[model samples]
Target chain A: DEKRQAVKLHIESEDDLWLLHLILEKDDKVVAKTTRDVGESRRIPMTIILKVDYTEFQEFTNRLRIHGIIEDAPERFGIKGAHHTINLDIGDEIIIIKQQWRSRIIIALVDFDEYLIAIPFEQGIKILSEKSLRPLNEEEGIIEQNALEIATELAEYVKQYDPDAILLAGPGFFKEEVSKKVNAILKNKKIYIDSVSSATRAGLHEVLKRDIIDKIMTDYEIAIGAKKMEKAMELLAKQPELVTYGLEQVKNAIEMGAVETVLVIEDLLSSDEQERLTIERMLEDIENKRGEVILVPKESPIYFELKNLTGILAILRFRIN
Target chain B: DEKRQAVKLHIESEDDLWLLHLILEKDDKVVAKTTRDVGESRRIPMTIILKVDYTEFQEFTNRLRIHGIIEDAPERFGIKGAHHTINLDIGDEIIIIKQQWRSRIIIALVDFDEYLIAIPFEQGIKILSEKSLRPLNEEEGIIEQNALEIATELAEYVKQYDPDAILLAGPGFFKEEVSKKVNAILKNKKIYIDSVSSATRAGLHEVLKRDIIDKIMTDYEIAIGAKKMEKAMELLAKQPELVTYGLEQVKNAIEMGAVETVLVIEDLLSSDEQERLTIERMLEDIENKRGEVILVPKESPIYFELKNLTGILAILRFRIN
Candidate 1:
């Protein structure tokens, strides 16, 4: 006779979700089995519980379920971001731009010790810490060979993903080497830009504070059409001619139908809130005036020349007549 | 113009060797180029460099030595080592034993923050780490997923060069889980055994001191046919009459064609040099008498029994006339 095959997988803490992925077999049955049991406020609530689903329950009762033998399973498993997203207690004013490339990018922190923290972009939160690769050099420091091997492994990942650009937000020679080797093999497939701090979740936040994001946004396009952007911005810098500010001046220009050519910088246009509205207004204006607009990158020296004029500018064909 | 027309190429690293293979107009002229500076390292070197024979060098110089770009047409960068044999550090101590069943094994230290070394039995001494995998928290530890991944990666290496049994040595739970995962995936194709200590280079030293060489040195007939040595030792303990004592007594039995079997514990036999030599001499006599010889692991209880009864034992087969 089959014994009562009930394995009460104890998830005593709130932060046990990451290990949940390991214990539950990846299937619809497991998915259905997952239930959030947020018990009373006083008791430490077991955030989620995954018993066998109905079909699996029957199989378990019948002794036909293929349960994981769980040989040498880990004792205490948790996610990388168990407590917090950042490794340190720093300013929360730091905005993290969790850029979604084609592949799943494993952004980790490697300072004196290797700190692995998986950023959960989909959930818009930090996960647990057990998802991390074993820390390299827990003692004196990170060994050079181990660093190189990690870089090699990361390079392999970059190649597998074939990403458009790689924002390497880590303070080290290793990330640079990883980017170099990846680019070397993948052949102009990815671009690696550095961050001020180590590759921690907080480091990514810190990076968003700098002008680096704007710079990366424009670098690629500037390489292709630097001279054209330089010429357009050169003409826009002349004062009182036809200036466009945040959005009001562009709105005024759009209503008049007097504008001829519109100039827009590519990088300044990625910010969602302000840029999204600006794009809507700009497109509407262009349609109304029947004017031609050219997108330019700030990398051109002329972009610096047009200081405080506009990330977008307009030139009237008939001088506002 | 003719010089410019010649195929000029720049070769940098190992990956360029593939291009060289493509450019080889004829197999005979294909000579591998290796920089002396890069090829002499004790660590496994990447590229294989070969100097052209004097005759071929002269022929090429006379026929197609081109200066500037197009000056050398027949002169080509060679590629080798893809087909040829070179002495490379496959890894730490390699043990090669031929038997009916074939398998592969890998053991690594994850706990004590040590170097990631592999045990590939090719030739030379084995290097084991003094450190072991550490458990960071209640759930996750050094040997958990990290060791599992390491074992998976190492399995690919072992599959490349098959082995029968892998003796993995590392700290407790971590190494155990790693071995279990490897065995599960590999199935009956491989066998996994646990080594006593962390067995970094020190473990390798221990194996050498113990004369394990002779035990693994037998032909397929002897190595495979060598009885269930552990079981045999257990059996001998149950029946004291089946045991013999001292090199002198065993040698006497061999001379009189009375010895039916022999059991030698490896480690103890290595330290007792005089007795080992005597036993080696007695093996000739026993071989002539058609007496069976068996080797048991030094750590076995039967090995202790053999030590008490002198390193010789036998089953009489209804009293050897």
Candidate 2:
């Protein structure tokens, strides 16, 4: 039997809930033991398989809601096809199974006036995750203090993702200074610091275009994300009719067998019930027609563009009116 | 020298940022070390004090922004009376000092159709913090599963506040079943489970009015929150001229030196910057006149009433009109 990579985590605090909320997504399998009534026995512990339908965490109550269906159950339990809601709390052991998992890298762009942290995905980049920090003073001490604070913030985010490598890019030696402070905190993780002219969304694009990030992170999702976005944009510019964007157009293209490759933002899968179901059906139809599907993460720049142009985009195999 | 309670925390992950974001509020003193230029030394580590003006955490970047003023610093450092921004990150140690702290109790009202978690304070109640979970199936096993999930969610919230006690109130035996599961997760914490008919906002009020909760939690903020709200309602019904609700009328009453006691919701402090500042000034003026200022949390039913009536309410010393 082929099994997916299973990560077992012990829920200990609200922090764990936040981390789990970030990690778990659609189609992920969660296995846990919950008490059930088997005939006369009131509290019989049964292991159940939950196929995730949706996942969300409330900020104030520190609660993670993993709503799904019971995919697997014991024959004797006589509890098949039941709905299960996993309320993640401290002290519960949860096992998550997914096809493949990789550590994520968090990129921080630091400057005097602007400090931004960008997380790259296989689609493009996600901006405005962290609030931009602006120092109120121009004094050397104040700037340096703000820099350390930025480093600390970046390091904390990196810890949450537990990404394979962390990349810091900015205009000058400030990146190096922040890198030094980050290194002091994260001794085991791989940290890379590079120079970029700006520390905004454009600066993140510049950093993504660099060869160093590509060379070191060739197998990473962000690398693939940048390449796909570049390809989609190139096809859009060179052959305008060969590309289609937005859910309706992409669905229409898929129906006409015009879609060569369909690109979607991950958020679209969980945004609305009817829309999620429609997209899921559309993806299945595309796959059946021998077309390709690519999921763009919320962090990707391409995802942002796609969001602005309707959350779904498609590269058509043939032009159609 | 008199010193406030200082809590030291290490920024290890994004979860810490979330926790810190909840813990640190306005008027708290934050102390951290940042690099400064002392003569020729370009990046000398210097300790600085920040009188917190505002604090917020970005969800995407997991960055914590602590914006404040440089309250205490060495004269030789050459950075005095300047505004400072402390960017909190992983691997940083931050010390937060406040006048006093209390162990908060989380009140959860759970029933078949509704699940609400309310944290009471001296002001009122805060709702909509945690997303409410509703069971899709009424199967025996499914109900049992949801009970465990709700218990787990409550346990996780309790762990965050490290509350002195946890009160679970519902109609009947279901509360007991959930209480058992919650007790399994939290052995040392004081747990109180009582009976209430509904599990909605009104249910929270019923739980608050109960003598058992007051007997056990007499010193807690929520107890005072409930009492003050009841008193305000009583005054409103019996002597309409003595009561004022809404921001404008409350401000007018305060200006007339007519407010004997004023009540404000805690959420108002962080909702709108302009409104918050205005309310803060009103509270200060009322205090200066030797009037009482009562802060209502969002969990109490009175908070809902106050929220509907405008977040500010006043019991005046005398009727102006």
Candidate 3:
């Protein structure tokens, strides 16, 4: 009785390869294109289904080693129920059949500095959401119209937030063109523009790496992240006890309402279930107690600097024993 | 006006030196025993005070470079208005005078394995907390009475928790004498003993490092920490997304009441205010949601292993996005 597979993942980046070993487990059937070794002959290429006994992380070779008894094979090969191993590497597509697929595989590692290191296979950028507001009556199909929409939207954001500087940047002529439209309207606020690839978060990192713009602004969110980090450092220095990190130290502080500002890393939110409940409840209570929570994005210096801290850090209003 | 000092720190361990660099700052006056040159005849030994301008961490010399203007000196030295620099190192005691003493300076670093590396200026073991509940009947104030209190307390813990093994270990015949009493009562559970230096957490670490006793009890708490770490790793590998670490992932999971088991390192409790507030609230809510929180001790294998983790880990009851 043949059964359809539950999942298919195209192995692209080495990150994709690391994800497999954690996912593939005992009794999960893995269907892959593997070359089998018949006694005293050249290797035979065939499609096989392996009921995984266990999988190993092959660090040196940079591969996923799944070893198990072969549950299904070509009848001509006579290899059913025989022992076999399949190594999954880049560019291989594998079919995985599990009784239940636990969760979607959107979880990945991201670094603030290395944001553009390895973008996924799907998109360099999905330019649809940022394109909806324009009227297409002219049928011009030009980005000049798109540029106007962006400029208008940017003005809306600037008016609402009232930031120090509204820095616009992206690939191609879009940023340069938008800034021209932007400068005419927002004469009061300090505004600037730079040339960087991608209008998404990637562009911010590209802008961050270069020293040209220190206070050019990526909006209010980024400036606050930088300020919170610096102020937390100040508290950590001047009043060591007032800055609580790790777990219980901060927990007990919030109990008596001593917390002023809280900082959390963005990727910490990727996990599911109990971890979520605690963090959510924690945030709710922290806000309920009138303290602010700053979720630092992975593309910020705060994220990298917080590596040495516990999962969270807080600048307290008062001391706790 | 002559102002006295608020804090005096004796830099003993390298860790002690690291703590100072974090605590010292601008405007805090530092008084130290230093040598000054009036005309470079012979470096004169004198006590002086300096109003701090800034401090730097000298990595090569392994010292703290305090740069400041001399605020006070011996009238004979005449260096009150001159700029001066002092390097604080091991075996130096300096008086720090700040306008307001922020917090008491008891903070220092500790490691599970290196517990015995540098004991302290205090006793190697306080040897007092574990010495109470002992009766001194005769003038013969021997360890035999102390042995009885330990044995009785051991029996009380055994009856309460009902563990698999009871490992009685310490420096000398005190442990050997106690084990005999321990064996008479603990016939139901698997139990044993070993020879380690201190009766504190350091001894538990010694037992943990070696291959001697696998099931020898260090109490139910130690066993639970080991189990939770292993189980969380299983969830991390098998379910992948069912286990959460870092921040928001765990928070959201808890919010949905999908968390089952929560694990936190004991030292996470050492932080203050907002951090403590969120952690405590998070933990309270998790318990409210009928999930258990295991506060893992720093001495357990869990602490060292969780260095890669975000100071917290949890096993979820169900999946989430």
Give interface RMSD, every candidate, in order.
Answer: 28.7, 15.3, 26.8
Model 1 lDDT per residue over B163-272, tens place: 55455444356556666777777775434344423333323322322323223333222443245344445655765444455566565566667766666655534524
Q: A230-321, model 2: which lDDT tens digit per residue?
A: 78888889977788887778877987999877777777765353465577778878878987766667666566777776777787888875
DockQ of each: 0.01, 0.01, 0.01
Give each model's whole-structure lDDT.
Answer: 0.39, 0.68, 0.58
For residues A125-186, write the lDDT of model 1, one tens digit per residue: 34223223354446554455555555555555555554445555555666665455445554
Instruction: Report the lDDT of model 1 for residue A206.
Output: 44
Instruction: Supply the global lDDT for candidate 3.
Output: 0.58
TM-score of chain A of 3: 0.39
Best by lDDT: 2
Ranking of predictions according to TM-score: 2, 1, 3
Docking class of 1: incorrect
Summing lDDT over every window of 10 consecutive residues in candidate 2 chain B, give the lowest-scoring window: B1-10
User: How accurately is candidate 2 docked according to DockQ?
Assistant: 0.01
Off by over 4 Å in 2: A1-168, A171-321, B1-4, B8-219
